[PDB]
Amino acid sequence: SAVQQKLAALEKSSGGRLGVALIDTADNTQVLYRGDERFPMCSTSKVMAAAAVLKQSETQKQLLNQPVEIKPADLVNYNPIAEKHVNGTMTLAELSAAALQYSDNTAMNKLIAQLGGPGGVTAFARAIGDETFRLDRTEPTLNTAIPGDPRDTTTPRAMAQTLRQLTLGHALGETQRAQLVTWLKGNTTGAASIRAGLPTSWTVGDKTGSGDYGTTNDIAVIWPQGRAPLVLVTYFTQPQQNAESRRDVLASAARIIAEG
Numbered sequence: 100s101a102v103q104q105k106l107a108a109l110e111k112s113s114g115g116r117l118g119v120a121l122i123d124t125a126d127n128t129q130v131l132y133r134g135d136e137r138f139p140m141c142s143t144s145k146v147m148a149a150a151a152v153l154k155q156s157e158t159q160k161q162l163l164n165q166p167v168e169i170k171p172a173d174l175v176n177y178n179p180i181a182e183k184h185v186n187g188t189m190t191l192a193e194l195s196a197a198a199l200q201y202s203d204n205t206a207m208n209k210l211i212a213q214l215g216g217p218g219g220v221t222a223f224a225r226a227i228g229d230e231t232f233r234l235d236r237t238e239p240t241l242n243t244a245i246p247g248d249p250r251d252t253t254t255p256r257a258m259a260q261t262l263r264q265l266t267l268g269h270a271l272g273e274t275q276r277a278q279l280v281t282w283l284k285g286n287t288t289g290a291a292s293i294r295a296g297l298p299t300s301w302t303v304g305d306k307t308g309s310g311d312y313g314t315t316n317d318i319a320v321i322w323p324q325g326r327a328p329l330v331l332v333t334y335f336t337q338p339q340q341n342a343e344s345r346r347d348v349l350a351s352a353a354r355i356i357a358e359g
Contacts, residue, residue: 105355106132113348115337120255121356122263125327137252138334139244141308142202143316148210149195150265151223153275163192173205176239181205199282204238211237227270231257242310259332266320291346292317296353300324313342317349
């Protein structure tokens, strides 16, 4: 198809490996490019950890208000919100927000601990029908993005379907889903990624991710004006261990999709 030819040309010009999945919820059609290849998730995995804690809060009604202590030993390499609360507490809601909207790595590690380790995040994926997602490590080593390594990977097709079920579907309770959507819509890190390739009147909720090998990712739910929502996953990685991030590739892939 025309879109797939343009995405292949974009990939060739970029020198990397691009994976795209679009679900159009108007007719449940899909557009895929390397849709079944594995890519390193990096921080896009934080959506799954936050959704898992949201699922626990359906039975533990007060869980999101539970205070969690932030100690100096908890801080890792990138903790823009947790740093502000060292030797104090943050609730699980505040940690989920920090993880999603600022990509805070300490916040992610607290969410993983709440779920009982990376195996608890993976379990949640399996419970909602995602047999592809795997989380193996904590922050910051889950971002090593080594070519061929299956740890901490998913495919574009699997992540698009799962993001659809979490945000537009009913994998979560109604209050929980609305909370997740509100968090995604308030992301602060996405201005130069998928959002940059889309009409400025469209509402987007997204989670970015970045890591070694120039890995540059973004997953988004998109609400066009007077038109059914879309789910769009864009993953990108490069052959050089020290390659620079390429958010422009994600923007360009979104623009090519939006032309459809």
